[PDB]
Amino acid sequence: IVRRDEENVYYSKYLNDCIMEAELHEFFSRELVDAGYASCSLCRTIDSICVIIQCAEPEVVMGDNHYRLHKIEYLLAGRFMCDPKNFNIWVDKIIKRGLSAEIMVDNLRAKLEEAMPIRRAAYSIIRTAMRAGAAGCEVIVAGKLRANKFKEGCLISTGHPKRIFLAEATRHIKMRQGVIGVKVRIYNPNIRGAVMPDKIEIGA
Amino acid sequence: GKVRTKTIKRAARKIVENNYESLKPKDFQNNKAICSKRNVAIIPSKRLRNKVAGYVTTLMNRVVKGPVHGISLRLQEEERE
Amino acid sequence: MAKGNRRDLLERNDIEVRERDKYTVHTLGKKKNSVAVAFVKAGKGDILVNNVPLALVRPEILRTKVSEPIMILGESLFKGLDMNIKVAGGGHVSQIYAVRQAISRGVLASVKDEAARSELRAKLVSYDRQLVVSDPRRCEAKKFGGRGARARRQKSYR
Amino acid sequence: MHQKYTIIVVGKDLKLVERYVKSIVKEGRAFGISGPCRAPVRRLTITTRKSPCGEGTNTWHRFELRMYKRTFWVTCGGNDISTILSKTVVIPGIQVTVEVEEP
RNA sequence: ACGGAGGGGUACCACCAGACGUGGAGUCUGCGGCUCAAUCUGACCCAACGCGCGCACCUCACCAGGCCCGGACGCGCGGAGGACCGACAGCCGGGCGCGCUUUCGCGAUCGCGCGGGCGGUGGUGCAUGGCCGCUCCCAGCCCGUGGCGCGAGCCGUCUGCUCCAUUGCGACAACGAGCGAGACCCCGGCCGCGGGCGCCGCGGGACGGCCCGCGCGAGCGGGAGGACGGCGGGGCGAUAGCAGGUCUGUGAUGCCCUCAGACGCCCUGGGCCGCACGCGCGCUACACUGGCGGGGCCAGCCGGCGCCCGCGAGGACGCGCGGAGCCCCCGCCGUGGCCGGGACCGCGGGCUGGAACGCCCCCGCGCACCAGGAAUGUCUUGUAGGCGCCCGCCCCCACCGCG
């Protein structure tokens, strides 16, 4: 009735582009950290890909008339062998920075490498999140200093709701004595106006 | 599931005390329908709605046969003397 | 080879169209991965299976099982109905049971009267209830801990 | 003019892939675009040991990635290449929801 | 924390009642020991031993031998009156302008030293991150105010009744919240709508709801009607902790060791398979509830076929088309280690690959094995058991693992 090796191109064409992206995420994390990159995407255009990004400091990523962004633009082209010009990156901005784990973890990492100790940085971060409308955070720092945790309020850590409400991130810090494993988790029960189960109300 | 968690019981008690004139016990259709109303109460999930409604009917018939403490029925008129 | 849920089997497009319409009633029966489709038209009386006479279906020993819906009742009504069953699925026995279920359901519908239908329902269900209502249980999965659904690989504590 | 063109939608997420078709059929309200064939799901599967060193009770991750796809070959030559572009613009811009048009 | 102390509970990783097995043989594989030049290493009760995803070369660290610098960047000296680099021919060399013997070619891409690198399946998992395993197939863990004690601490957080469950009812110097449990997500059984190349998208339905017994109480027993009746199968997984495993998964890494006769990278061979022996997960059998021949026939994760040679395995062509064992029927064999059993071995015909030590088919020979001791493992419905079929790593190969 149908042949199974025709649709295989379409199926395999979509899978390749997925991997084509993760490499972008890795590269941005290794490069555009200065602007606190958060996440990316893709949109296969007629003759290119309309990759858009999210970075808290949009100004840092782009340069004079986006000059350094243009610089990056050609680079990717050769790596993926796509025609330049057709490439058309886009730049976005994040509003509630105290609601994203990755920007906070990166700022916290930088701060830690500023000679300031774990306690002040962790409490600064949790204060920043809570003042940004979050039910709670949790900072864990592990390395040659064991594990010294810090926590403020209520978090969930089990169930399906975790993957959508709770957002976690991790990093590694190369310090002279060794490595300082640091991670962060934030639980926002109001994301995108989604109703957490077993949360009820009754009226008059 | 036979033992009902605390949330079910507390919300069901609230519903009965609040909407009593329109919850006829011993049926699982009327009470479910009424609990479906958002002016009455809101249930995010189907199974939770059915569970709450069932506990509400059992509480309501237990009360109609013999009212309980903790649920206000405004029965003073027949006990105000 | 056939899945059982193919559009072709369900709609019995194998039959030629001018003969497709003459069949009115439609019926269904299943057991485990087996789907049997039956079309009925009133007639001198006869049955078929996968293009085979009902008698010469080869579990042989289970002929009475495929014919129970008939000898349970009288041949009076079965005389006026003709069927062209088409079955496809897993296992000979499963096909057999699905076929008898489809026969029962199809004959039940064609009565066209509700009270006599209820009376036949009472008669038939008294005998094996799984002649009208389907059987639910189905094969389950297997977990990596063992090499079976519930059995586990032998463990050596020493 | 007439090209016997085809429309194919490929994606992973059931939510968008089902919402996007609704907009497409809206846009094809008058050009005769009709129901889409929904292909069987291509559930890709992979298994892997959870332990990088293979210690302890042998456990296994089970990740899978589905590939929903729909086809609106209805247009065929019923529409002109002039508005085939119009077909491709009024539609919403979903970040990942690959599509391709062939005759 | 422990108790060969008491009282309540609980679980086929416990028992009752049963079922199917292992330990007895042959064999696949891994683990110790012996051997060699090497037979590379990690792990050793639960919680090491078909596990670190299929070892002819690479994989690969190990053994016998051999190419190359592929020494960044700075400073000092030298250099086109010539820094460094290749080569026909003859010998020694497994071979290479590898080495030597004559003499042509190339031209600053640098040469020597000092500072300073990169690299490395090299070491410490008892320096660490990350990820898993176990405690844990558990039901437990804590906060603000308040009170009791000099204090470490106690109450909150239950010597009552229920739940598989700190799940609930009802009390009390406690009051009020939170995490885990539940809810939650995937799959399947019934029904409806819509659409439809290919059966695939959105919703209803079951809730201890009805009847009868009890119990204040939550909740237990029985009966119905219904596709399904009382945690249907999976995913997620609390606090705190371990000197559990992993530096041999990585541009994850501190400190050590190696760095121009190299532990760098590469090439030719060999080895990881070697065997007096001990055992761990498995496979084949010891037969009549059977073996052989002919025939009929139905699955799902899903899926590619025609013609012609050849006994068969296989082979040359050309195009898009397509599914099995058990089982049932007819006959032979007739209790004999026999027509049960197919290990081992000898000619031969083919496939992969640069290269067979790898894998298939044919003729011939026809080992132990007569139901397996002390001991021991798993299991409650589409379940055990029996029967076969696809994927994984893969040039060839599945007794393995996921399904």
Side-chain angles (χ1 to χ4, degrees), chain A residues 171-184:
Chain A
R171 288 290 125 81
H172 307 62
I173 312 184
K174 309 182 217 333
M175 314 210 39
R176 60 286 304 131
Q177 82 300 48
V179 166
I180 294 330
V182 76
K183 76 155 62 75
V184 172

Side-chain angles (χ1 to χ4, degrees), chain A residues 195-204, chain B residues 11 14-15 18 40-44 48:
Chain A
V195 68
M196 220 199 64
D198 46 37
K199 181 98 62 206
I200 303 171
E201 156 280 343
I202 287 87
Chain B
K14 302 231 303 272
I15 295 174
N18 233 20
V40 167
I42 155 181
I43 292 317
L48 261 156

Side-chain angles (χ1 to χ4, degrees), chain C residues 1-67 69-111 113-158:
Chain C
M1 24 196 76
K3 204 70 51 92
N5 47 349
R6 297 160 110 88
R7 186 185 192 175
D8 331 331
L9 158 59
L10 293 173
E11 90 172 4
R12 286 282 290 268
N13 45 3
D14 52 73
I15 316 177
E16 68 95 347
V17 202
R18 281 141 318 297
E19 191 205 272
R20 205 99 66 64
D21 40 324
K22 263 157 284 298
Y23 291 137
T24 60
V25 174
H26 312 324
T27 321
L28 212 49
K30 30 183 315 184
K31 173 45 161 48
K32 53 147 91 167
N33 267 226
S34 81
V35 180
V37 198
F39 282 28
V40 153
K41 75 173 187 216
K44 172 219 56 50
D46 162 33
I47 322 291
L48 280 178
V49 185
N50 247 333
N51 243 348
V52 172
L54 193 277
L56 304 320
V57 60
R58 284 234 312 160
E60 312 185 14
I61 176 60
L62 305 179
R63 298 271 174 82
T64 305
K65 279 287 179 181
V66 280
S67 304
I70 306 174
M71 302 88 44
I72 273 173
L73 321 169
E75 276 61 16
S76 56
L77 61 158
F78 290 95
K79 155 177 44 51
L81 292 61
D82 295 51
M83 272 174 232
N84 297 158
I85 292 104
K86 173 56 176 1
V87 49
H92 300 108
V93 169
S94 304
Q95 290 194 170
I96 289 287
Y97 276 115
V99 159
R100 50 193 299 261
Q101 209 156 224
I103 291 168
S104 144
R105 281 203 232 160
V107 85
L108 204 59
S110 178
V111 69
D113 167 20
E114 171 45 50
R117 174 189 332 281
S118 84
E119 171 273 348
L120 300 186
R121 261 300 320 266
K123 262 187 59 35
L124 200 34
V125 72
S126 175
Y127 197 107
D128 186 310
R129 177 189 172 182
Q130 311 78 341
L131 257 186
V132 176
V133 312
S134 171
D135 191 299
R137 43 191 209 292
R138 214 134 295 186
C139 192
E140 97 175 14
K142 74 140 283 184
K143 274 55 61 176
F144 55 69
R147 76 284 214 197
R150 308 249 183 119
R152 286 318 100 160
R153 306 194 246 159
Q154 167 165 351
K155 176 207 276 194
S156 191
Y157 284 100
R158 194 108 60 186

Side-chain angles (χ1 to χ4, degrees), chain D residues 8-14 16-54:
Chain D
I8 320 165
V9 160
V10 153
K12 75 181 72 159
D13 169 29
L14 182 275
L16 321 145
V17 158
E18 278 287 84
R19 180 203 38 46
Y20 178 114
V21 319
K22 170 39 208 83
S23 154
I24 269 206
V25 65
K26 170 274 301 183
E27 176 160 5
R29 71 306 163 207
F31 276 68
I33 313 314
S34 320
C37 77
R38 291 159 176 162
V41 198
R42 204 179 204 83
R43 57 210 162 201
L44 306 132
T45 284
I46 273 283
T47 69
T48 316
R49 288 282 316 280
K50 285 147 87 105
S51 180
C53 37

